[PDB]
Amino acid sequence: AAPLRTRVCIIGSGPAAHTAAIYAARAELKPVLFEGWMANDIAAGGQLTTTTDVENFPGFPTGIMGIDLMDNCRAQSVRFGTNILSETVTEVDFSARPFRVTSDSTTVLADTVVVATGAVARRLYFSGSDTYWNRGISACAVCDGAAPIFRNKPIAVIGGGDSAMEEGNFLTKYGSQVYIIHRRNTFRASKIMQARALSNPKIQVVWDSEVVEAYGGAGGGPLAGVKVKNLVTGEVSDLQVSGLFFAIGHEPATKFLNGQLELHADGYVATKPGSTHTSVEGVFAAGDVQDKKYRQAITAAGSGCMAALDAEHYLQEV
Amino acid sequence: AAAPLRTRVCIIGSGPAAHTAAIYAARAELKPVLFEGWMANDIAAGGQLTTTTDVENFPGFPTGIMGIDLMDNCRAQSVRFGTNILSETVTEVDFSARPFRVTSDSTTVLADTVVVATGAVARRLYFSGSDTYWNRGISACAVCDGAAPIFRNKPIAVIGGGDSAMEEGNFLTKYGSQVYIIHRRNTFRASKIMQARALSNPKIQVVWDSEVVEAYGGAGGGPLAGVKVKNLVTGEVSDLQVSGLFFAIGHEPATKFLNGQLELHADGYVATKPGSTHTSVEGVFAAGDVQDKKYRQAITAAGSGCMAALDAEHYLQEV
Ligand SMILES: Cc1cc2nc3c(=O)[nH]c(=O)nc-3n(C[C@H](O)[C@H](O)[C@H](O)COP(=O)(O)OP(=O)(O)OC[C@H]3O[C@@H](n4cnc5c(N)ncnc54)[C@H](O)[C@@H]3O)c2cc1C
Ligand SMILES: Cc1cc2nc3c(=O)[nH]c(=O)nc-3n(C[C@H](O)[C@H](O)[C@H](O)COP(=O)(O)OP(=O)(O)OC[C@H]3O[C@@H](n4cnc5c(N)ncnc54)[C@H](O)[C@@H]3O)c2cc1C
């Protein structure tokens, strides 16, 4: 009954959301941003808070920790007038204008909305997966591959996408042998990507299989092996390995929208290519919630900028 | 769906409780159908024990046994006696009618009795740094990991305000140099006794009205080194050096799927008739951590699963 009214409501708190906030606020639109309260089991600030060392975000010659970069983006958004609610959005209503955005505690009436809730890397929860997390297992092959523990030892990658093919190749630069493990006998990845990996000397595919257990050594040591179950024969085999990486995609954060935006089948928001426009006039989508191809902080930042300008431009025509 | 499995006893869950219930139901020739989940609730079939490495207090194993192996044995045992195990997660039940209807994505079972044994899952927070330093300082099992070298003689933090937080705090002062309980309020939910035994502890310091907003490491990409704590009154944020941080903020009983059809306590646990597995619905039983927040052991949960089988067997005979 006491709804905040704003020209621009931003949902999410990664690089996209914050770049959008910076431009919307500087354009004197007084944006309200919902940064979440551990929304989606990711801290406000977004995926970057789950990594330690960001080296490819332009402007930081020495690199910068994700948490610090995102601390900066938020301080910047606040500095220009962004009103940040530390609340998770649970529901929207895009059938009427102004649009309604609500959390547990707050209700906002917004002339435009930027959806920038991002995505989260997918993992499995087979026996041993929590146990050996950061002690062999990880969901970022590229983050951790170089690391000593894996050098010259065998690595496993689970997945059947383009990501799995490329992370597999990437890992054969550090490991002694790489195993791609996939549930089916056929890859979802492009025919090209399948070939570049299948042609790789240090990669061996393990079709028709699932990992059913990860175990360690010692002495409570780090990851030492995985039990793999063939899904045709039923047979279970030990497979020695110092690393296991998840390359099974990313889960775009769109369930809260309850279907009110047109999505692709993988759940990402369908945008007008080369803009942030969605299926609903006045609602925009920026960042990883609508990009599975690049998935970078820098691209997502760019997209957030675009979402602000698009919204600003849509306000002017209305 | 239109080809429903019919059974005297349908068991939902795959921990010690479910499997002991299966072992008894199957041996009593009741041909139980068990839904072990497909990573239901983001825990492997086998249950919480699959998230630990060394179980030392389950009677019968003088040398200890790894959780995964123990639960591999329970399952092989359930199968050996005829249990039909679906590797599927239950999404919905119907307890308004008999036989009871239990369904997963793929299967529908019509059951004369149901044993709910879906257990629980330790709660955690997802502040910045929490995934990062998981197993590299941060953990949800103070008692599992406290002894470990990394923590010896260094400062530890515990988050929570329950009886568990008080006791895990005390337990940690045996290994650390100093222990900090961190809680959102200025008052503890724990019993007045427990609050006193911790507040009286020399090596424990409480950090009221606070939240952890970040965990950071050292080096060189080293292990947990500190946490940023935010006071919720003043707003101030402070660095607090620490080699370990443990979650003692309770357990989440796996009862949402029941969608209200069993009477729950406010914390979500299934309300059972004390000293049995009887629930608010005749013919439906609850065993294990899904209805026990007090003991929470594999051995007690096993005992309770046995009870659920015999209770159901006894209820079939009177019906
Ligand atoms: C391990 C790892 C390492 C990475 N390293 C790099 C790197 O070195 N360089 C690089 O460029 N990129 C890196 N990335 C990728 C980068 O994190 C993402 O590409 C980028 O963060 C996408 O940002 P986004 O703005 O789309 O939001 P995200 O970072 O995905 O954040 C979305 C945020 O919105 C919040 N939210 C979600 N739902 C709601 C809701 N309903 N209401 C309110 N808030 C909500 C979430 O809590 C989340 O904090 C890495 C990713 C990972 C996982
Ligand atoms: C890290 C850790 C270490 C521990 N170490 C010990 C120890 O050494 N000794 C000890 O006695 N106790 C220990 N415990 C506690 C012990 O594991 C639990 O008390 C015990 O497992 C409770 O078992 P349960 O049978 O009630 O169900 P749980 O083990 O909680 O299992 C429930 C299972 O059912 C499945 N499930 C849930 N919902 C559904 C659904 N809807 N459909 C299908 N399947 C579903 C889940 O996937 C899960 O596998 C430990 C706990 C933890 C977390």
- Quickly list DSSP for chain A: ---EEEEEEEE--SHHHHHHHHHHHHTT---EEE--SSGGGS-TT-GGGG-S-B--STT-TT-B-HHHHHHHHHHHHHHTT-EEE---EEEEE-SSSSEEEEESS-EEEEEEEEE---EEE-----BTTTTTBTTTEES-HHHHTTSGGGTTSEEEEE--SHHHHHHHHHHHTTSSEEEEE-SSSS-SS-HHHHHHHHT-TTEEEETTEEEEEEEE-TTT-SEEEEEEEETTT--EEEEE-SEEEE-S-EEES-GGGTT-S-B-TTS-B---TTS-B-SSTTEEE-GGGG-SSS--HHHHHHHHHHHHHHHHHHHHT-
Same domain, B178 and B224: yes
The span from the CA of A27 to the CA of A10, in Å, is: 14
Q: What residue's CA is closest to ligand 1, atom 29?
A: A46
What is the number of alpha carbons within 13 Å of residue A154 lying toward its C-beta? Answer: 12
What is the number of alpha carbons within 13 Å of residue B138 lying toward its C-beta? Answer: 26
Structure tokens, A41: 């089991």
What is the largest distance, in Å, between two alpha-carbon atoms of chain B?
68
Catalytic amino acids of B?
141, 144-145
The span from the CA of A27 to the CA of A139, in Å, is: 38
Nearest to A201 by CA among A176, A166, A181, A184: A176
Ligand 1: centre distance to CA A71 (Å) = 13
Q: Which residue of chain B is at minimal alpha-carbon distance from A43?
A: B127
The span from the CA of A177 to the CA of A180, in Å, is: 10
- Assign B13 to helix, strand or coil: coil
Nearest to A88 by CA among A47, A14, A42, A38: A38
Concatenating the DSSP letter of every residue in B118-158 gives --EEE-----BTTTTTBTTTEES-HHHHTTSGGGTTSEEEE
Among A11, A48, A89, A256, the mutation site with the greatest number of ligand 1 atoms within 8 A of its Cβ is: A48
Q: Which of the listed residues A194, A227, A249 is the one where a domain comes to its end?
A: A249
Beta bridge partners of B177: none
Nearest to B275 by CA among B287, B290, B266: B287
CB atoms within 10 A of CB B308: 34
**Under 8 Å between Cβ of A243 and A136:** yes
A38 to B68: CB separation less than 8 angstroms, yes or no:
no
Give chain B's length.
319
**Under 8 Å between Cβ of A114 and A308:** yes
The span from the CA of B100 to the CA of B282, in Å, is: 11
Same domain, B136 and B78: no
CA distances in angstroms from A55 to A13, A42, A58, A64, listed in the order given? 20, 21, 8, 6
- Is residue A140 part of the annotated active site? The answer reads yes
Same domain, A47 and A4: yes
Nearest to B248 by CA among B175, B145, B104: B145
Same domain, B145 and B175: yes
Same domain, A115 and A263: yes
User: Which value, in Å, is the radius of gyration of the alpha carbons in chain A?
Assistant: 22
Q: After which residues is chain B broken (C to N over 2.5 A)?
A: none
The pair phi, psi for residue A124, each rounded to 5°, is -105, 165
The span from the CA of A192 to the CA of A4, in Å, is: 51
The pair phi, psi for residue B212, each rounded to 5°, is -85, 130
Same domain, A197 and A150: yes
- Long-range contact pairs involving B176-179 (C-beta distance under 8 Å, separation at least 24): B176/B146, B176/B151, B176/B152, B176/B203, B176/B243, B176/B244, B177/B153, B177/B203, B178/B203, B178/B204, B178/B205, B179/B155, B179/B203, B179/B204, B179/B205
Cα distance from A59 to chain B (closest Cα, Å)?
22
Same domain, A111 and A200: no
In 3-state terms chain B splits into helix, strand, coil percentages (rounded to 5) of 25, 30, 45
What CATH number does the domain containing A211 carry?
3.50.50.60
Same domain, A254 and A116: yes
Q: Choosing from A9, A73, A144, A291, which is the catalytic residue? A: A144
Domain that includes residue A137, residue range: 122-249
DSSP H/E element including B104: strand B100-104
Structure tokens, B219: 């080096």
Mark B123-154 as b/e (b = at least 16 C-beta within 10 Å).
ebbbbbbbbbbbbbbbbbebeebbeeeebeeb
B11 is in an annotated binding site: no
**Under 8 Å between Cβ of B245 and B156:** yes
**Under 8 Å between Cβ of A152 and A175:** yes
Same domain, A142 and A237: yes
The pair phi, psi for residue B61, each rounded to 5°, is -125, 80
DSSP E strands: which ranges in B42-88? 84-86
Distance, C-alpha B16 to centroid of its chain: 12
Q: Which of the listed residues A249, A282, A300 is the one where a domain comes to its end?
A: A249
The span from the CA of A109 to the CA of A103, in Å, is: 12
Q: Which of the listed residues A249, A282, A307 is the one where a domain comes to its end?
A: A249
The pair phi, psi for residue B58, each rounded to 5°, is -100, 115
If one counts the domains in chain A, the total is 2
The span from the CA of B66 to the CA of A265, in Å, is: 41
Same domain, A131 and A114: no
Give the type of residue at A87. E
Token look-up 């007008």 returns: A272
A215 to B68: CB separation less than 8 angstroms, yes or no:
yes
What is the number of alpha carbons within 13 Å of residue A268 lying toward its C-beta? Answer: 19
Mark A39-67 as b/e (b = at least 16 C-beta within 10 Å).
bbebbbbbbbbbbbebeebeeeeeebbbb
Query: Given in angstroms, what resolution was this structure solved at?
Result: 2.6
* DSSP 8-class letter at B271: P
Shortest-distance atom of ligand 2 to CA B88 = 43
**Under 8 Å between Cβ of A90 and A106:** no
The method recorded for this entry reads: X-ray
Cis status, amide bond into A259, omega within 30 of 0: no
Same domain, A62 and A87: yes
Contacts of residue A234, Cβ cutoff 8 Å, sequence gap at least 6: none
Starting at the earlier edge strand, list the strands of the sheet with A137-138: A137-138, A243-246, A154-158, A177-181, A203-206
Angle subtended at Cα A98 by Cα A97 and Cα A102, rounded to the nearest 5 degrees: 115
Concatenating the DSSP letter of every residue in A160-205 gives -SHHHHHHHHHHHTTSSEEEEE-SSSS-SS-HHHHHHHHT-TTEEE
DSSP H/E element including B226: strand B224-231
Cis status, amide bond into B202, omega within 30 of 0: no
Angle subtended at Cα A164 by Cα A158 and Cα A167, rounded to the nearest 5 degrees: 110
Contacts of residue A63, Cβ cutoff 8 Å, sequence gap at least 6: A53, A54, A55
Token look-up 């004390």 returns: B274
Could you tell me where the DSSP H helices lie in chain B?
16-27, 67-80, 142-145, 163-173, 192-199, 298-317
**Under 8 Å between Cβ of B170 and B259:** no
The span from the CA of B311 to the CA of A144, in Å, is: 51
**Under 8 Å between Cβ of A80 and A26:** yes
Same domain, A153 and A98: no
